[PDB]
Amino acid sequence: GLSDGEWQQVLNVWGKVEADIAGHGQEVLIRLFTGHPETLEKFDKFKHLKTEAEMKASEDLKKHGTVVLTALGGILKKKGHHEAELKPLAQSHATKHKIPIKYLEFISDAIIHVLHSKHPGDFGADAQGAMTKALELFRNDIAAKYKELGFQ
């Protein structure tokens, strides 16, 4: 698990995200889609975005960045006590959306990348360690639900 001090660092970092949830969410999705174009292909509603300028111009991509990061934020504020937020979220993602656990790795790494890009010098080593652990916990608990469901 994470220590109390590690959770406090995660939720301190998340305050940066909450000052501009839509711009963080947009930049995280853009980082995901440009670095791993197979992930774009999973979004019928974003498949038409062929360039980064089109992605940056998409108000609906910003909207979904908000939806994604609001969900993750609520889960992180549970400090690991997230079985209910997570279980039905893992079922949607495995069964409705058909999203390999690899893509949650990719988006974890995108979150770390975006935090450094928007907060250079203000996202230190302890904060990065703690955030990375929190995001590993999130995807590991999804992965357990994926194994139950045989999506593996």
The answer on whether 93 is annotated among ligand-binding residues is: yes
Distances (CA, A) of 17 to 35, 55, 65, 97, 105: 21, 20, 11, 25, 19
CB atoms under 10 Å from CB of 85, counted, come to 18
Helix (H) / strand (E) element for 6: namely helix 4-19
Only one residue has tokens 């890009």, namely 117
Give yes or no for a contact between 123 and 10, defined as CB atoms under 8 angstroms apart. no
Only one residue has tokens 């770390």, namely 112
Structural domains in the chain (count): 1
Give the DSSP per-residue string, 44-91.
Answer: TTTTT--SHHHHHH-HHHHHHHHHHHHHHHHHHTTTT--HHHHHHHHH
User: Largest Cα–Cα distance in the chain?
Assistant: 43
Tally of residues, the chain? 152
Only one residue has tokens 């992180």, namely 76
Give yes or no for a contact between 43 and 6, defined as CB atoms under 8 angstroms apart. no
CB atoms under 10 Å from CB of 48, counted, come to 10
The answer on whether 97 is annotated among ligand-binding residues is: no
Give yes or no for a contact between 123 and 12, defined as CB atoms under 8 angstroms apart. no
Residues 6+ apart with CB under 8 A from 125: none
Distances (CA, A) of 60 to 20, 25, 49, 86, 88: 16, 11, 11, 24, 24
CB atoms under 10 Å from CB of 9, counted, come to 20
CB atoms under 10 Å from CB of 4, counted, come to 8
Position 20, amino acid: D
Residues 6+ apart with CB under 8 A from 135: 108, 111, 112
Q: What is the CATH number of the domain that holds 96?
A: 1.10.490.10
Q: Which two tokens stand for residue 125?
A: 């080593």
Only one residue has tokens 């509603």, namely 45
Which range marks the domain in which residue 23 is found?
A: 1-152
